[PDB]
Each structure stands twice: as C-alpha cells, then as structure tokens.
C-alpha cells in the first residue's frame, strides 16, 4: 500500500503505475503528447505531461512510476508555465496554417496549443516547402514542417512491425525522422502500413494522396469511374463525421459515392468473395493432393512486402489467388466490359481502403494486363472522407441506397474479411464445403477471432485433421518465425495480417486521440459491425453469392484453373532467384 496526494487528494493505492496513468484512471486531468503505445520519446521527452513532486521538482507524469509519500500538483502556476514553454519551443519549429492542413478537425497538437495559450517565440513560415516535404512513396508522404519529433511514429512502427524502418536521422546537424539513409520508405524494409501515420498528432506523416487521379477521372467525358469499398470502410468513416463508434455506415456510402458522381458503385466485398473462391479452391487442392503445406495467404500487401523484404523464400508458399482488390480490378477490366459494352480502356477502378499499402500494391508493375491497370487508384478512407467535406455532402443525413448488384453483392464471409481471422474463417466455409461436397450449417469459427497476436485451431475437413495458424500484427510474423513456431507442428494454412486487428486498424483509417483510444477498444468496435452483418446475412459463404456465381459461370469457368488461374492469380517476382539486388 502507498499513500499519494494529487492536488490536495489523498489516495491509498497498491497499483504500480505512472502518474499520469493513476491520475487519468481517477479523473485528475494530465496533459501529454509524445506518451502512446505505453511509450513517451526517451531520448526528447516532450514535457507535456510535467508535474510537481514535492521535494523531487518537476517530473514527467508519463514514465514516472508513483511511490509512497508522493504529493504531487498537476496545475500549479510553476507546472503550467513549463508546459506551456514546451508548447511555444515546439510552435518554434511548426508551420502553424491550420486552415489548408489536412488535420485541422483532429489535430492533437492545436488542442494543447488551445488549452495553454500557446504561442511561438518566433513564428516558423517557410517560404518553401520542398526541402521538407518527401512524397517519393506510392503510399506515405512526409511533411516535417509539422513534426515535432515526438518519436510517436518511431516507437509505433517498432511496436506494430518490429522492423524499425521509421528512424530518427542526423540530415547535417539536425534531426529528421525518415527511412534509412533518407531513402523513400518503398525501397527500404517498411511495409508501408502506415502504423507511423496513425501514430502521429499532427499532419507529418500522411497518405500519398491518390484524390487527384479520381478526380481527373470523375471529370473526364470518356471514364466510366467505378468505385467500390473495402469491408472496413463502413464500419469506420462515420468516425470522421461526429457519428460516434461501430456505427454501421454502408448505405450513406453507397449514397455519398453517387452524390460524388462515380459512375458505378460497386463493393471489394464482392472481391472478397472471389478471393475466397480462389483460395479456398487452392486449399483443397493442396488438401486433396496432401501439400504442399503451409499456405500463407497474400491478401495483406503489408505482409507481402514483410515476405519480399524478410521471409523472400516463404513466396513460393503464398497464394496466388490476388488480393480481393487486385482481383476485383481485373474483373473490372474482363468481367465488366463483357456485361456493360463498356470499352475496357475507357474503365477507370477506384477503391476505398482503409490502408496505404494498398496504393503500393495497385501501382505494382505487373499488376494490368493488355495495358489496362486492374486498380487504376486507391482512396484511404481518410481520404474519401475529405472529398465527401469538400463536395458538402451532409454524410450524417443521408438516406441509405445499395451498390449495384453485379459486382456489388457479397456474403457474410466476406463482409467479416476486415478483422484479424476473417480471411480464415470465410476461407474455411467455403473449403470445407468443397472438399466434403456439403453444405455444412456449422460455419462460425470463434476460435480465430479477436486480438491474441497469434491465434491457432484444428480444424477437421474431409475426416482429416488440419492446423491452421492466423497470425495478427507484422511484430507476430517476426514472433512466430523467430521463435521456430512455425516447426513447432505441420501448418497447413496461415493467414497473415500486418496491421493488429487486422484492416480495421489500417494505415488509412481515421485517427483516434489518444483519450478516446482508452475509452474505447476501437480494433474490436469497429470489427462488430463487420461481424453484425455476417449475422444478418442471408448468404454467408462466399460461394453462394450469386452474382458471383453468374460471373463464373458465365466468364470465368472453374475457379483455380484455366482462364481463372491465368487471369485472376498473380505470382510474385522476387519468388524467383536475382543478383544483385
Ligand atoms: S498539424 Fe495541427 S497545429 Fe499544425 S497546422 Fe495542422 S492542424 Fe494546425
Ligand atoms: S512524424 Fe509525427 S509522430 Fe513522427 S516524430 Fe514527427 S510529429 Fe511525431
Ligand atoms: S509504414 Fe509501417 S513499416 Fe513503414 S515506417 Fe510506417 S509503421 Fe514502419
Ligand atoms: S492488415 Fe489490412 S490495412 Fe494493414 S497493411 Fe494489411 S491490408 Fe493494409
Ligand atoms: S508525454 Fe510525457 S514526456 Fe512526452
Ligand atoms: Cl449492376
Ligand atoms: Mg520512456
Ligand atoms: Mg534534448
Ligand atoms: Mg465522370
Ligand atoms: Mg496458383
């Protein structure tokens, strides 16, 4: 037992925490900015969290654990002008332009500027920006005239990666965050998750912004504009609208699209059944054939690069079906065509994603046939967002409407691909059908859900045994394969995602500040509305979608064969030998 007193209460407590961690769970109100992820910047703490200690001086709350006999004040006049000279020091080194910045409603840095009254001795106004600005990779983008080297993005992309491709950097004599060496993050080891993005308070990190390709196409007379949303957009983009948590927002999307004039609104839920399609197609045959073993998925472009980048000769085991934003863009140049009269050079794909690597995965060489992209660009839903602001769309008062059916409907297995096991519990629906030739009601598979990094089952198909492993985070790979888990037992399929929670917590969803963060388990809110509406769905295996089914048998033929294999998998390059590289 210890006693404490925090402005003038007294407290007996045996928990061992920091100051601000006891304060905030009793409602005695502490400023920070460079804490998250149970982390603050060690080597340039930033001050915010400042307390008195009698008989210490000032302390940071944040990483100071509470002892025996503390008396500590939060709000003295001493505390308060030390935080607010550590805001005014930070203001010294900040283009302070709130109106054009793409944070201006959810800045954590202009609400403390706000509370304490902040100022800069000396304001910072660049006349230039290009020697601060890095917007070489196809999915983030760097502007350190916002950044106040709190290190959040260094320590979040050590914790949700553990690759450390987010570094601080000496550039002559000054410190930067960036990659190593300076380079575009894309040729270095990142994945291009954008867990840095999430982490920042500020508009330093971002999206590489793909607003502009759309809206050159929405504006051109020859595009026929398609657009369709990843599962975990309608679970989230209501954040961004003062509609609260796990608010299910698909049909005011559907609504707000055709209010942006996109001229057909279809969903990556249907993709996602394709996938499925695919995949589980696979599965079997390697089950019927007895290997090879393990499959990984290659649905979670994150992963892959972790694969090019760590794990090269783990390629070979991939799938090949493509991701369902891959596939669902060849369709939309194939499939399509031959169901609209559209002339395929004139389709333009769009996606909303909650997720930066994405953009990486669209912009891949190989991925177009006959000149045509299959995703000619890709919208964070931060993004979609915005354009739906700037167009004075009452997002929140709108009426629902449907996507159009015929890449637009999809099952509840594939509704749920956007939390951490969803991918492997739609894939099992299906293949276990396929390889017992049934229609099996037993079809939820709660044992692979939820947020353990590393979540294992047996599953029986066909009268055999199987292990199946769901891996949930980038630092899980690592953990998994460093530790020899993946010899520990035969694996015969391993879904990988790199982003913990799977897409629902992606690089390009909408931030959440840190307060709200402990108020609220967002991973799994915002996965219960995918969950709900598998629940709801009549159809909840991805080969009774039947939109999907006339696509097949009308265009495609058996899935995991002939025109469906060449056209609909995709292998990659650096699966085969090179040097150097
Ligand atoms: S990062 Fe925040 S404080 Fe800085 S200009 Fe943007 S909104 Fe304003
Ligand atoms: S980029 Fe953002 S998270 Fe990273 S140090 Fe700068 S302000 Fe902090
Ligand atoms: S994109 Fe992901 S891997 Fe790359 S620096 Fe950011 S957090 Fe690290
Ligand atoms: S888990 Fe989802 S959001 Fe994260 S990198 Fe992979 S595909 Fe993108
Ligand atoms: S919040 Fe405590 S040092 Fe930054
Ligand atoms: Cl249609
Ligand atoms: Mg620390
Ligand atoms: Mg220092
Ligand atoms: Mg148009
Ligand atoms: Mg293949």
Request: hydrophobic share 35%.
């Amino acid at each position: 037992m210890k006693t404490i007193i925090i402005n003038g209460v007294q407290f007996n407590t045996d928990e061992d925490t920091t100051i601000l961690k006891f304060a905030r769970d009793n409602n005695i109100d502490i400023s920070a900015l460079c804490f998250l992820n149970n982390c603050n910047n060690d080597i340039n703490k930033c001050e915010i969290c400042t307390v008195e200690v009698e008989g210490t001086g000032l302390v940071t709350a944040c990483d100071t654990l509470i002892e025996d006999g503390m008396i500590i004040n939060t709000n003295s006049d001493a505390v308060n002008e030390k935080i607010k000279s550590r805001i005014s020091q930070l203001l010294d080194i900040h283009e302070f332009k709130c109106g054009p910045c793409n944070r201006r409603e959810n800045c954590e840095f202009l609400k403390l500027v706000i509370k304490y009254k902040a100022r800069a001795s000396k304001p910072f106004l660049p006349k230039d920006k290009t020697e601060y600005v890095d917007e070489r990779s196809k999915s983030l983008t760097v502007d350190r005239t916002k950044c106040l080297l709190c290190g959040r993005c260094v320590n979040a992309c050590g914790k949700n990666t553990e690759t450390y491709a987010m570094k601080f950097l000496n550039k002559n004599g000054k410190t930067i965050i960036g990659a190593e060496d300076e380079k575009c993050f894309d040729d270095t080891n990142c994945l291009l998750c954008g867990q840095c993005i999430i982490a920042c308070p500020v508009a330093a990190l971002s999206e590489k912004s793909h607003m502009d390709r759309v809206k050159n196409a929405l504006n051109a007379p020859e595009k026929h504009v398609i657009v369709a949303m990843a599962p975990s957009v309608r679970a989230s983009i209501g954040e961004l609208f003062n509609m609260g948590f796990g608010v299910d927002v698909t049909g005011k999307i559907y609504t707000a699209l055709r209010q942006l004039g996109f001229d057909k609104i279809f969903d990556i839920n249907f993709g996602a059944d394709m996938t499925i399609m695919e995949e589980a197609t696979e599965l079997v045959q390697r089950i019927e054939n007895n290997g090879p073993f393990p499959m990984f998925t290659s649905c979670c472009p994150g992963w892959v690069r972790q694969a090019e980048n760590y794990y090269p000769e783990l390629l070979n085991n991939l799938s090949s079906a493509k991701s369902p934003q891959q596939i669902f863009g060849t369709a939309s140049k194939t499939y399509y065509p031959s169901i609209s009269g559209l002339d395929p050079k004139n389709v333009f794909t769009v996606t909303v994603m909650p997720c930066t690597s994405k953009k990486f995965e669209a912009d891949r060489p190989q991925m177009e046939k006959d000149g045509l992209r299959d995703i000619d660009a890709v919208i964070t839903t931060r993004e979609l967002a915005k354009m739906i602001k700037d167009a004075k769309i009452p997002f929140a008062k709108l009426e629902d409407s449907e996507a159009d059916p015929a890449m637009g409907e999809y099952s509840g297995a594939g509704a749920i691909f956007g939390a951490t096991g969803g991918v492997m519990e739609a894939a099992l629906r299906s293949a276990k059908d396929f390889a017992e030739n049934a229609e099996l009601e037993d079809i939820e598979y709660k044992q692979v859900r939820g947020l353990n990094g590393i979540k294992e089952a047996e599953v029986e198909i066909n009268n055999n045994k199987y292990n199946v492993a769901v891996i949930n985070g980038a630092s899980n790979l690592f953990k998994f394969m460093k530790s020899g888990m993946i010899n520990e037992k035969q694996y015969h399929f391993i879904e990988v995602m790199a982003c913990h929670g799977g897409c629902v917590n992606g690089g390009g969803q909408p931030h959440v500040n840190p307060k709200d963060l402990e108020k609220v388990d967002i991973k799994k809110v915002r996965a219960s509305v995918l969950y709900n509406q598998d629940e709801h769905l009549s159809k909840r295996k991805s080969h009774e979608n039947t939109a999907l089914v006339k696509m097949y048998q009308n265009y495609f033929g058996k899935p995991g064969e002939g025109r469906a294999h060449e056209i609909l998998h995709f292998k990659y390059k650096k699966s085969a030998w090179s040097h150097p590289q």
